[PDB]
Amino acid sequence: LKNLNDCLEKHLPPDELKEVKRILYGVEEDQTLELPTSAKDIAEQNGFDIKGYRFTAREEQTRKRRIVRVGAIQNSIVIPTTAPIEKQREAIWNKVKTMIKAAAEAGCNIVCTQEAWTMPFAFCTREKFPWCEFAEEAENGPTTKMLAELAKAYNMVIIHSILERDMEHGETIWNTAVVISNSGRYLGKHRKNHIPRVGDFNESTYYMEGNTGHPVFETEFGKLAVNICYGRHHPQNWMMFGLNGAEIVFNPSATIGRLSEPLWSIEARNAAIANSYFTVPINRVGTEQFPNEYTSGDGNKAHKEFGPFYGSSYVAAPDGSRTPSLSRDKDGLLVVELDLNLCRQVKDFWGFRMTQRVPLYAESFKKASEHGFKPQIIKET
Amino acid sequence: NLNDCLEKHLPPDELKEVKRILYGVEEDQTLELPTSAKDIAEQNGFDIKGYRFTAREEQTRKRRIVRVGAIQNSIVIPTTAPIEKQREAIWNKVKTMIKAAAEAGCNIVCTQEAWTMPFAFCTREKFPWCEFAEEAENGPTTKMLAELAKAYNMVIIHSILERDMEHGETIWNTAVVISNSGRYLGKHRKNHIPRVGDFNESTYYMEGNTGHPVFETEFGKLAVNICYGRHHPQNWMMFGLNGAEIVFNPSATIGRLSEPLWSIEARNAAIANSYFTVPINRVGTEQFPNEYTSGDGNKAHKEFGPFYGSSYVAAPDGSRTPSLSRDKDGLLVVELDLNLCRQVKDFWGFRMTQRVPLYAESFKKASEHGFKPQIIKET
Amino acid sequence: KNLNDCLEKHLPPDELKEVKRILYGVEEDQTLELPTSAKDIAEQNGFDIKGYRFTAREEQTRKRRIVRVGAIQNSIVIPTTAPIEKQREAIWNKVKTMIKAAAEAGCNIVCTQEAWTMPFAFCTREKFPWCEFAEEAENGPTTKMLAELAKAYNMVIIHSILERDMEHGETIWNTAVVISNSGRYLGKHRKNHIPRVGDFNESTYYMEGNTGHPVFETEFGKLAVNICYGRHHPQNWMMFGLNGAEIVFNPSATIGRLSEPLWSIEARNAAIANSYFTVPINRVGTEQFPNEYTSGDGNKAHKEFGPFYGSSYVAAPDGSRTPSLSRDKDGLLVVELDLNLCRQVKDFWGFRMTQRVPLYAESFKKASEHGFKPQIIKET
Amino acid sequence: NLNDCLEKHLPPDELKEVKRILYGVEEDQTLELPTSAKDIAEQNGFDIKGYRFTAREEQTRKRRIVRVGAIQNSIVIPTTAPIEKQREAIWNKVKTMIKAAAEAGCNIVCTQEAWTMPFAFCTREKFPWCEFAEEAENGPTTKMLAELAKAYNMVIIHSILERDMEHGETIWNTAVVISNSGRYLGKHRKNHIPRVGDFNESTYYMEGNTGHPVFETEFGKLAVNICYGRHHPQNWMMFGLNGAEIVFNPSATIGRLSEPLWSIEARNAAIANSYFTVPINRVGTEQFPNEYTSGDGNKAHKEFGPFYGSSYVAAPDGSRTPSLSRDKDGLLVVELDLNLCRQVKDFWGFRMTQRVPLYAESFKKASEHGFKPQIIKET
């Protein structure tokens, strides 16, 4: 398939379509956003999707509307995996550079990449060479330095995810999101909290669990957070970003395939409802093939191909509504404009945070983590 | 009913793919139901649908196959009638629904929230609605249900208004677990209490102090997450950490804003915690003696609803049962192998990567008075 | 519209002496003479000002600790259908001048009613625009503003507002804030007991307070605030007592027919029982809201809410009490007291000496447990 | 009688409002008393007044109407007379009062504190005052009263000095509940012991170790809060948490400082715990053989008093009965519906919001040696 939304509108009477969209997405028909004519042109020529949507809030008496625009960019790797790693990184750089420009002309304020956007998702091979040389410094690394310039020039916050080598702490590798301010200056980094070891995603071979905690970045365009890939699955992770005051939480990821796809429209969505903030799940696209054969921990014979990464990036709102997805197979830039005020508004109406009883759960979790833990199971007497 | 509508509008090969993304599988794993059970359903005018979840065959463990029956219904006689007559009409309706679940071979049967009464909390009147509250162990509904449990050899879980005698005659929102021996297993009180809109439940009862209990029955480790607690992922999480395998979600929700969240919340919980999830919801629209306002700008009214039914079951691997009807009484019978839980936990490894010690610490800090969020500013 | 004035208007002076003895604490009120200029402000702006005095016995080892408190009851000012900032500002300006009169009357501690900054909008159960009244505890406009009058008049100011907590998920709370006479923010305390009875749907807006039972050590005594519904829980008043309180203010907002006879009772007992001073303050007038609401009774929907019956007073540890202010007029109650009366009563009556708290600590633990079996004795 | 004074000086429409604020209602809900009862009271020269409290009609519960008789009296023969003759005189006076209560159709009758003796504790003499102390179960007063209980089919609660034989012949201040069957139900010992002024009760007995018992009689769950315990709201509260519906408060207080507290303390308890309260007080002034001092600066005297009577009943909804006389023997007969308890519990929800776990913990902390009060200072 290509885009579920397009499929549903190509097969259903308009009034039933209205209802199906009401239950699947948040609204009755898409709140489209009209995009600058010059931006659509960049996208058409370079052959990538550009779609615009709008979320709104109610008008407040003591607070002016806080309208902000985000650009989520999904892409594939560009030149064959058997080519100097520097050339690989540079091809992706130049593709995305043009996508960041379209986002800029579409008037975005925060732009964000997928997970390990800088490289083919090489962790399936479990080879250290030459794949580790993709790992750069978080602050002074080429990609950050480069990206920092487009940030200053377009006056927009850029969040991106790369392999990080930490020099000071024993040259160790980490999976890191870095937030670049609209001033051009490096704001900080956050390391992936939850590390996958399921199947082809042998990420536990390359780096340990993140020790950056759950930081929220206060930029001039909202309090932003990044929940990296597999951390998608841990609702207690999403929750902690919430407790630290996040308003948009980006979810850069990289997932194939049959079992993982139905979870896509569920996990990110729930987090947005539950913590009452915005959610931006971004996913890699295309399928990638590697030099030597590998096995995936199933019974299967060894192969070289990895994929297909199913794209389908979207944005989830705190009130339960959500943007249609982008393509499953085609590069794309998702531009969505939102009013940050909807966060507090929903928090006040549904009162999820008023009823969390976090002290109770902090105590119950501490008990459960202890050695002598005896579960609260009631048996028949 | 969404599943029926998608099959009535899409080419079979594309419907295969849309079902793959929306539900867990490419075409529903139907269960064939005993001929006599569909009969009772037919006659009494309620839906009966059967589905099957399966697990991989294990070397060291026999397949633990179990059958659950989720029962959604409406109230039955007008809200303006002796409260005992009201409870008894719903009693008799559901009595025969539990019988059809029995003949369909269920082992655990479960009700919606406050299944014994019109959801009268929208009026915020204490009279005569508080008289629906009974005792958890010796209350008429538990006593009566306890006999069907012994007779049909099945665990029955149900949700009622509870009056606690010993603790100052206070009211609570409680699910009661009745063992298939007939004997009362225990109760669990609603952890998270809503105050949004028409759902003025904070007016009738406090937050539950039963913790997060899991009941070891011979048909699995079961737990009940009541209604609004649906929205709290740390809630589902804790039943998980206590070793749950099927967590029922009895509920009662109307409306335009609440309906899109239905297919989302209970589903994720099943994926996240790697266990089974049984969300059940009341059906029909109910109308009350005197006018009330809903906390919106609008004028006072007497009608409340419509409750949108749509009960389903979610599996630990991400798959899910189609929903029942949005407006018709229904019995959902689904058979599952409880081994799918550990199997998924082993393959995805969600529980091995939870880092609960860190979250236990992080949440303690956050709940403290001097809490300074981890916000990074530009220097 | 005032019980003291009514009883003095209908009874022979010798019988009135005895009726006052049993209803209030004394035989004839111990009036306080108020500065000429303060009564002036009151007269002009159309609000009551009444002064009374409580005294203690003189001690050998301790100087008289004489202190003056000013309780301010008022109504909202401009119609509820108007920019919420305008509404708060009108009440601001009215009360500003009332705190001035309290200042010239020589008060040292001034205190407001409950949610004094807003129409008591909780009866409608609407979140918009009423939640925008909620401000920060320390940096909120009302605290900032009041903090200046505190520095300038050299007086401790206690007030009650809707609080939005930023750090903890922008949640709303019902908070009393104590501002020191230095001008600096001393701290806050959140309403321990939350009502859900009738039109008072406060459970819809905020959870139970997690601040415990704080007592503020100011240079004018150890003060505490027991907010509104917490009025009804004697174990509440008790705990402020155990924490060493000497004056416990009770900012409140209550209508009506069932609630009124309880007014003279609850706050009074607490003063007797814990052997400290009690300052119950209540909103005044009746307020009406944009759209119709129902009150959880059988009755039809309405717009009007009230009437709030004012009637603020002070209760003393020895059982005596000030007359109340008016039932429907703005008022400033100025009462001067010797804080030594507290320990003196404690030593004569010995209530704290005989509390047996260990035993109640134990009994209450048992009662809160799941397996609780009441101590009921049946016939054999 | 303050009530009589207020109706003798105020225009009826203002009186209606003053009554509304002071008592619970706008004009007294009088009860019409049997003709024969008023007669016994007339002839023996004691007051008999009847009032009525009502509840709302319930669907699932029949009205639980019950009648209580509170009896206030004075000592009757001079303190300088064989103690047995003294007790006997009071016996014979009250015996006829219990009879009037019986004909007025009372179901529960109750005495004041140490009803059996002049309140001799002011002298601090052990002789002959200690010989007034009898056994709880086998004591002459209990035995005799138990007969009238069987014969009139009414629960009798009374307060005496108790000598405990088994535990070292020690003296206690005890309320004894005698069932309407005639059989001894149990006893409860005064929890809080006064040492203020003339009330040197700590000289005669220690603190009660019977806890906070509630007696399940067929006319309600009853409790007795003795005298000084009237001042401890935590005491009242515990009887509430043990499920009481009527709590009697037998007392003996004089004086100028103590009287304004009378219409406050017992009243609050009833609103706070949402049950019925019956404070009873001794009447008249009593004179003793030898001079004593009262712990003030004053010279020694022989007279003690005056005890100010003024017994009444407090309802859970905030309403209350007028008082009896300040100086005259009296029987207060009041009929109430016990259902008003739960009804008000439901509406005001005091018990639902008590947060007992919190206060159980806070009180434990406070009682400990290392206790640092929660005092906030300026930084």
Side-chain angles (χ1 to χ4, degrees), chain B residues 191-218:
Chain B
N191 278 329
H192 298 256
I193 306 298
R195 42 264 297 173
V196 42
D198 281 299
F199 296 92
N200 303 293
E201 296 164 53
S202 62
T203 327
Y204 296 72
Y205 37 79
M206 281 292 275
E207 341 292 276
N209 54 359
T210 51
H212 292 82
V214 159
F215 291 98
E216 196 155 337
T217 75
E218 65 182 24

mmCIF file of all heavy atoms in Angstrom, chain B residues 191-218:
data_model
loop_
_atom_site.group_PDB
_atom_site.id
_atom_site.type_symbol
_atom_site.label_atom_id
_atom_site.label_comp_id
_atom_site.label_asym_id
_atom_site.label_seq_id
_atom_site.Cartn_x
_atom_site.Cartn_y
_atom_site.Cartn_z
ATOM 1 N N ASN B 191 -8.938 2.964 40.849
ATOM 2 C CA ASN B 191 -7.775 3.766 41.241
ATOM 3 C C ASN B 191 -7.846 5.222 40.810
ATOM 4 O O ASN B 191 -7.382 6.105 41.534
ATOM 5 C CB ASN B 191 -6.491 3.165 40.672
ATOM 6 C CG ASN B 191 -5.947 2.030 41.502
ATOM 7 O OD1 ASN B 191 -6.114 1.987 42.721
ATOM 8 N ND2 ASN B 191 -5.267 1.104 40.841
ATOM 9 N N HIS B 192 -8.406 5.471 39.628
ATOM 10 C CA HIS B 192 -8.427 6.823 39.060
ATOM 11 C C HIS B 192 -9.861 7.334 38.863
ATOM 12 O O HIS B 192 -10.637 6.738 38.114
ATOM 13 C CB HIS B 192 -7.602 6.867 37.760
ATOM 14 C CG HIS B 192 -6.151 6.540 37.961
ATOM 15 N ND1 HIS B 192 -5.161 7.498 37.963
ATOM 16 C CD2 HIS B 192 -5.525 5.360 38.187
ATOM 17 C CE1 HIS B 192 -3.990 6.923 38.175
ATOM 18 N NE2 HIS B 192 -4.184 5.626 38.317
ATOM 19 N N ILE B 193 -10.206 8.430 39.539
ATOM 20 C CA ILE B 193 -11.581 8.912 39.554
ATOM 21 C C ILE B 193 -11.790 10.159 38.689
ATOM 22 O O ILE B 193 -11.162 11.188 38.930
ATOM 23 C CB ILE B 193 -12.053 9.145 40.997
ATOM 24 C CG1 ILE B 193 -11.841 7.887 41.839
ATOM 25 C CG2 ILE B 193 -13.507 9.556 41.042
ATOM 26 C CD1 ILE B 193 -12.619 6.663 41.362
ATOM 27 N N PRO B 194 -12.679 10.064 37.678
ATOM 28 C CA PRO B 194 -12.943 11.138 36.715
ATOM 29 C C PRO B 194 -13.816 12.251 37.274
ATOM 30 O O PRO B 194 -14.668 12.011 38.126
ATOM 31 C CB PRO B 194 -13.719 10.432 35.606
ATOM 32 C CG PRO B 194 -14.411 9.352 36.286
ATOM 33 C CD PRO B 194 -13.512 8.882 37.397
ATOM 34 N N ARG B 195 -13.605 13.461 36.778
ATOM 35 C CA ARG B 195 -14.444 14.588 37.133
ATOM 36 C C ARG B 195 -14.767 15.398 35.883
ATOM 37 O O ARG B 195 -15.334 16.489 35.964
ATOM 38 C CB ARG B 195 -13.781 15.457 38.213
ATOM 39 C CG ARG B 195 -12.278 15.717 38.053
ATOM 40 C CD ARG B 195 -11.436 14.734 38.875
ATOM 41 N NE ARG B 195 -11.653 14.845 40.320
ATOM 42 C CZ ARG B 195 -11.141 14.021 41.231
ATOM 43 N NH1 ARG B 195 -10.377 13.003 40.871
ATOM 44 N NH2 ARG B 195 -11.398 14.212 42.512
ATOM 45 N N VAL B 196 -14.416 14.839 34.729
ATOM 46 C CA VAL B 196 -14.640 15.478 33.435
ATOM 47 C C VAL B 196 -16.084 15.395 32.955
ATOM 48 O O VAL B 196 -16.623 14.308 32.766
ATOM 49 C CB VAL B 196 -13.708 14.891 32.337
ATOM 50 C CG1 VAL B 196 -13.606 13.361 32.453
ATOM 51 C CG2 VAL B 196 -14.161 15.312 30.926
ATOM 52 N N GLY B 197 -16.691 16.558 32.755
ATOM 53 C CA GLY B 197 -17.982 16.669 32.086
ATOM 54 C C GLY B 197 -19.149 16.093 32.854
ATOM 55 O O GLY B 197 -19.420 16.512 33.970
ATOM 56 N N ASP B 198 -19.835 15.133 32.239
ATOM 57 C CA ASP B 198 -20.991 14.468 32.821
ATOM 58 C C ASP B 198 -20.568 13.414 33.811
ATOM 59 O O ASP B 198 -21.369 12.926 34.602
ATOM 60 C CB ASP B 198 -21.774 13.766 31.724
ATOM 61 C CG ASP B 198 -22.642 14.706 30.937
ATOM 62 O OD1 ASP B 198 -23.541 15.331 31.536
ATOM 63 O OD2 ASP B 198 -22.436 14.797 29.711
ATOM 64 N N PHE B 199 -19.303 13.039 33.746
ATOM 65 C CA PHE B 199 -18.801 11.963 34.566
ATOM 66 C C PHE B 199 -18.333 12.531 35.896
ATOM 67 O O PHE B 199 -17.131 12.674 36.149
ATOM 68 C CB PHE B 199 -17.681 11.210 33.834
ATOM 69 C CG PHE B 199 -18.136 10.514 32.570
ATOM 70 C CD1 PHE B 199 -18.055 11.157 31.333
ATOM 71 C CD2 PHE B 199 -18.643 9.219 32.618
ATOM 72 C CE1 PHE B 199 -18.465 10.519 30.167
ATOM 73 C CE2 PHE B 199 -19.060 8.582 31.464
ATOM 74 C CZ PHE B 199 -18.966 9.234 30.232
ATOM 75 N N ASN B 200 -19.307 12.858 36.738
ATOM 76 C CA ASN B 200 -19.060 13.474 38.026
ATOM 77 C C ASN B 200 -18.928 12.412 39.105
ATOM 78 O O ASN B 200 -19.682 12.399 40.064
ATOM 79 C CB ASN B 200 -20.223 14.409 38.351
ATOM 80 C CG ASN B 200 -20.445 15.476 37.285
ATOM 81 O OD1 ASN B 200 -19.609 16.362 37.094
ATOM 82 N ND2 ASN B 200 -21.589 15.411 36.610
ATOM 83 N N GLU B 201 -17.966 11.516 38.942
ATOM 84 C CA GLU B 201 -17.826 10.382 39.844
ATOM 85 C C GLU B 201 -17.080 10.734 41.126
ATOM 86 O O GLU B 201 -17.228 10.052 42.139
ATOM 87 C CB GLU B 201 -17.195 9.215 39.107
ATOM 88 C CG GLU B 201 -18.085 8.740 37.998
ATOM 89 C CD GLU B 201 -17.373 7.869 37.025
ATOM 90 O OE1 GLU B 201 -16.742 6.872 37.445
ATOM 91 O OE2 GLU B 201 -17.444 8.192 35.827
ATOM 92 N N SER B 202 -16.313 11.826 41.077
ATOM 93 C CA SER B 202 -15.593 12.384 42.231
ATOM 94 C C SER B 202 -16.559 12.828 43.312
ATOM 95 O O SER B 202 -16.175 13.072 44.455
ATOM 96 C CB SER B 202 -14.803 13.606 41.786
ATOM 97 O OG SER B 202 -15.698 14.595 41.316
ATOM 98 N N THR B 203 -17.814 12.957 42.918
ATOM 99 C CA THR B 203 -18.881 13.404 43.780
ATOM 100 C C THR B 203 -19.386 12.262 44.664
ATOM 101 O O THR B 203 -19.906 12.503 45.763
ATOM 102 C CB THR B 203 -20.015 13.942 42.909
ATOM 103 O OG1 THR B 203 -19.445 14.538 41.735
ATOM 104 C CG2 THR B 203 -20.836 14.974 43.656
ATOM 105 N N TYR B 204 -19.208 11.027 44.187
ATOM 106 C CA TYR B 204 -19.787 9.832 44.825
ATOM 107 C C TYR B 204 -18.783 8.965 45.576
ATOM 108 O O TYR B 204 -19.155 8.261 46.514
ATOM 109 C CB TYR B 204 -20.509 8.966 43.795
ATOM 110 C CG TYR B 204 -21.691 9.635 43.163
ATOM 111 C CD1 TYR B 204 -21.514 10.666 42.247
ATOM 112 C CD2 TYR B 204 -22.984 9.233 43.466
ATOM 113 C CE1 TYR B 204 -22.594 11.297 41.653
ATOM 114 C CE2 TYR B 204 -24.082 9.854 42.875
ATOM 115 C CZ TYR B 204 -23.875 10.891 41.970
ATOM 116 O OH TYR B 204 -24.935 11.533 41.371
ATOM 117 N N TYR B 205 -17.522 9.011 45.157
ATOM 118 C CA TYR B 205 -16.475 8.184 45.757
ATOM 119 C C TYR B 205 -15.042 8.702 45.592
ATOM 120 O O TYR B 205 -14.725 9.395 44.620
ATOM 121 C CB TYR B 205 -16.564 6.740 45.241
ATOM 122 C CG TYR B 205 -16.963 6.546 43.777
ATOM 123 C CD1 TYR B 205 -16.030 6.714 42.746
ATOM 124 C CD2 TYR B 205 -18.261 6.143 43.430
ATOM 125 C CE1 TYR B 205 -16.390 6.513 41.414
ATOM 126 C CE2 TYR B 205 -18.622 5.937 42.105
ATOM 127 C CZ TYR B 205 -17.686 6.127 41.110
ATOM 128 O OH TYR B 205 -18.035 5.926 39.804
ATOM 129 N N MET B 206 -14.187 8.341 46.553
ATOM 130 C CA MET B 206 -12.760 8.702 46.561
ATOM 131 C C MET B 206 -11.898 7.753 45.727
ATOM 132 O O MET B 206 -12.394 6.796 45.122
ATOM 133 C CB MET B 206 -12.221 8.728 47.996
ATOM 134 C CG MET B 206 -12.574 9.975 48.744
ATOM 135 S SD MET B 206 -11.746 11.432 48.080
ATOM 136 C CE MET B 206 -10.165 11.343 48.929
ATOM 137 N N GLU B 207 -10.596 8.012 45.715
ATOM 138 C CA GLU B 207 -9.662 7.168 44.981
ATOM 139 C C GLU B 207 -9.480 5.846 45.702
ATOM 140 O O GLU B 207 -9.392 5.807 46.924
ATOM 141 C CB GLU B 207 -8.303 7.847 44.807
ATOM 142 C CG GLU B 207 -8.306 9.357 45.002
ATOM 143 C CD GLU B 207 -9.073 10.095 43.921
ATOM 144 O OE1 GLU B 207 -8.484 10.368 42.846
ATOM 145 O OE2 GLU B 207 -10.264 10.411 44.159
ATOM 146 N N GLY B 208 -9.414 4.771 44.929
ATOM 147 C CA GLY B 208 -9.305 3.416 45.453
ATOM 148 C C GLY B 208 -8.018 3.131 46.186
ATOM 149 O O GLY B 208 -6.941 3.519 45.747
ATOM 150 N N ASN B 209 -8.134 2.440 47.312
ATOM 151 C CA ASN B 209 -6.970 2.136 48.146
ATOM 152 C C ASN B 209 -6.651 0.647 48.228
ATOM 153 O O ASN B 209 -6.010 0.184 49.174
ATOM 154 C CB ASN B 209 -7.138 2.727 49.543
ATOM 155 C CG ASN B 209 -8.440 2.306 50.214
ATOM 156 O OD1 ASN B 209 -9.261 1.567 49.650
ATOM 157 N ND2 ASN B 209 -8.634 2.791 51.432
ATOM 158 N N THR B 210 -7.091 -0.092 47.213
ATOM 159 C CA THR B 210 -6.877 -1.538 47.142
ATOM 160 C C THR B 210 -5.562 -1.864 46.460
ATOM 161 O O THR B 210 -5.189 -3.036 46.377
ATOM 162 C CB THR B 210 -8.000 -2.239 46.367
ATOM 163 O OG1 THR B 210 -8.182 -1.573 45.115
ATOM 164 C CG2 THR B 210 -9.294 -2.200 47.142
ATOM 165 N N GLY B 211 -4.872 -0.828 45.978
ATOM 166 C CA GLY B 211 -3.597 -0.990 45.277
ATOM 167 C C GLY B 211 -3.787 -1.472 43.849
ATOM 168 O O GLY B 211 -4.628 -0.942 43.119
ATOM 169 N N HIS B 212 -3.014 -2.482 43.456
ATOM 170 C CA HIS B 212 -3.108 -3.031 42.111
ATOM 171 C C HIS B 212 -3.160 -4.551 42.090
ATOM 172 O O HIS B 212 -2.274 -5.176 41.515
ATOM 173 C CB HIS B 212 -1.927 -2.536 41.277
ATOM 174 C CG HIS B 212 -1.975 -1.067 41.002
ATOM 175 N ND1 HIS B 212 -1.550 -0.129 41.915
ATOM 176 C CD2 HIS B 212 -2.432 -0.375 39.933
ATOM 177 C CE1 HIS B 212 -1.729 1.079 41.411
ATOM 178 N NE2 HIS B 212 -2.263 0.958 40.210
ATOM 179 N N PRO B 213 -4.207 -5.153 42.694
ATOM 180 C CA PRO B 213 -4.218 -6.595 42.922
ATOM 181 C C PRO B 213 -4.404 -7.427 41.657
ATOM 182 O O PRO B 213 -5.118 -7.026 40.724
ATOM 183 C CB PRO B 213 -5.408 -6.784 43.856
ATOM 184 C CG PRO B 213 -6.324 -5.691 43.512
ATOM 185 C CD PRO B 213 -5.448 -4.526 43.176
ATOM 186 N N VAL B 214 -3.741 -8.578 41.641
ATOM 187 C CA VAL B 214 -3.940 -9.571 40.595
ATOM 188 C C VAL B 214 -4.467 -10.867 41.208
ATOM 189 O O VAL B 214 -3.971 -11.334 42.231
ATOM 190 C CB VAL B 214 -2.667 -9.811 39.796
ATOM 191 C CG1 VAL B 214 -2.730 -11.154 39.108
ATOM 192 C CG2 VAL B 214 -2.478 -8.683 38.794
ATOM 193 N N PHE B 215 -5.500 -11.424 40.587
ATOM 194 C CA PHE B 215 -6.171 -12.582 41.139
ATOM 195 C C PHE B 215 -5.711 -13.839 40.445
ATOM 196 O O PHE B 215 -5.859 -13.978 39.229
ATOM 197 C CB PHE B 215 -7.683 -12.426 41.043
ATOM 198 C CG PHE B 215 -8.217 -11.370 41.934
ATOM 199 C CD1 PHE B 215 -8.496 -10.106 41.438
ATOM 200 C CD2 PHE B 215 -8.401 -11.617 43.285
ATOM 201 C CE1 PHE B 215 -8.973 -9.102 42.275
ATOM 202 C CE2 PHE B 215 -8.884 -10.620 44.129
ATOM 203 C CZ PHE B 215 -9.169 -9.356 43.623
ATOM 204 N N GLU B 216 -5.135 -14.743 41.235
ATOM 205 C CA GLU B 216 -4.703 -16.052 40.762
ATOM 206 C C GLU B 216 -5.881 -17.017 40.752
ATOM 207 O O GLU B 216 -6.165 -17.674 41.749
ATOM 208 C CB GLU B 216 -3.592 -16.594 41.670
ATOM 209 C CG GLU B 216 -2.794 -17.767 41.095
ATOM 210 C CD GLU B 216 -1.365 -17.923 41.681
ATOM 211 O OE1 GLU B 216 -0.776 -16.939 42.196
ATOM 212 O OE2 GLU B 216 -0.812 -19.044 41.596
ATOM 213 N N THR B 217 -6.582 -17.066 39.627
ATOM 214 C CA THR B 217 -7.607 -18.071 39.392
ATOM 215 C C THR B 217 -6.992 -19.181 38.554
ATOM 216 O O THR B 217 -5.917 -19.014 37.969
ATOM 217 C CB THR B 217 -8.817 -17.495 38.627
ATOM 218 O OG1 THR B 217 -8.475 -17.316 37.244
ATOM 219 C CG2 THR B 217 -9.227 -16.164 39.205
ATOM 220 N N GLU B 218 -7.690 -20.308 38.476
ATOM 221 C CA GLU B 218 -7.199 -21.443 37.698
ATOM 222 C C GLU B 218 -7.415 -21.285 36.203
ATOM 223 O O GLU B 218 -7.168 -22.210 35.444
ATOM 224 C CB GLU B 218 -7.781 -22.755 38.192
ATOM 225 C CG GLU B 218 -9.264 -22.890 38.023
ATOM 226 C CD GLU B 218 -9.758 -24.200 38.581
ATOM 227 O OE1 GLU B 218 -9.079 -24.779 39.467
ATOM 228 O OE2 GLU B 218 -10.828 -24.659 38.126
#
